[PDB]
């Protein structure tokens, strides 16, 4: 297990997401679905010039998986995935420059919901999650797990035994008071409100 | 000069953009600025692991250049640029799959302003332009010009004599009744309305 310090500006951003009073937390799902759609666009685009990039899976989709027993919401896509080097770049983000630009925007009247315009929308996961685990597989690397409970660090390790083929899984270990995001009715409502017209199918899995 | 047929679904999309009654044409600028911001994020991200990718220019920005004598509006960025192969892929888009998904969305109640969610927002240029010329330079290829006045085809040729260093210029040859988009007051209004909080600076050039 390798432990890395977050880029300072990201540590500050995460702090702001966790500590600022902001009731509209449901936008985390829009942001993670947007990231999945971007990852899916990338593999689709790459496949136009090299069809063998889909040998690791032809279906391009997003699955939403609530688990009330584990208190987790997982967002899975079959997009391009991330290499170990991507994960070491603050979970595949333009962390430093994006946060700096985002903070200047917040001072000029922007609000937290604009986070995705700055390339750091993944970190909106911390509106609802105490810990986030990212499992990912890119065609050019092995499967890895990235994890952070904030506090200024993240870990990276190889992930074996449950291979995915290609893509990214974002596992949200929800805060105790954010269990509404495990309810089917609530997830459907948020998808229709913010992610109604996406370039890929979204399947909401059922439990028990 | 090489001439290419558009992917059929793109030819249909362009037809729909040119012929459908839709008064909110100003969203073309939001879409082109969004594309520039995405291109700028890509070069910024690539530079995190290879700083020499900025040897072709360190400044990451967007310029908006109106020219009333030529009746053109140009959107310039210093993003990652496009290779010749990208241009041949319908001006660097997921043309086929994106248009198909976008058309299904329009039947389900989506409208033209959602075009950017489907990876084909560049084609919103045809809301206001009779012809579009794209000049582009990627670090791994030479400078090229892509052009189309719709009608089912586009051209690609090398572009010499006015080298850019790195990035993309989108030159909109405006329709005669769309000259409001050359007015400083109008461009400022549209940028503030739709692109107020972007991850990169936008400079609106002055004329005469």
Residue numbers in the entry:
A (entry chain A), B (entry chain A): 17 to 224
How did the manuscript describe this experimental structure?
We determined crystal structures of the N-HSP90-L107A mutant in the apo-state and in complexes with representative loop- (1, 6) and helix-binding compounds.
HSP90 is one of the most abundant proteins in the cytoplasm of eukaryotic cells, comprising 2–5% of cytosolic protein under non-stressed conditions. The N-terminal domain of HSP90 (N-HSP90) contains the nucleotide-binding site, which has been the target site for drugs interfering with ATP binding and ATPase activity.
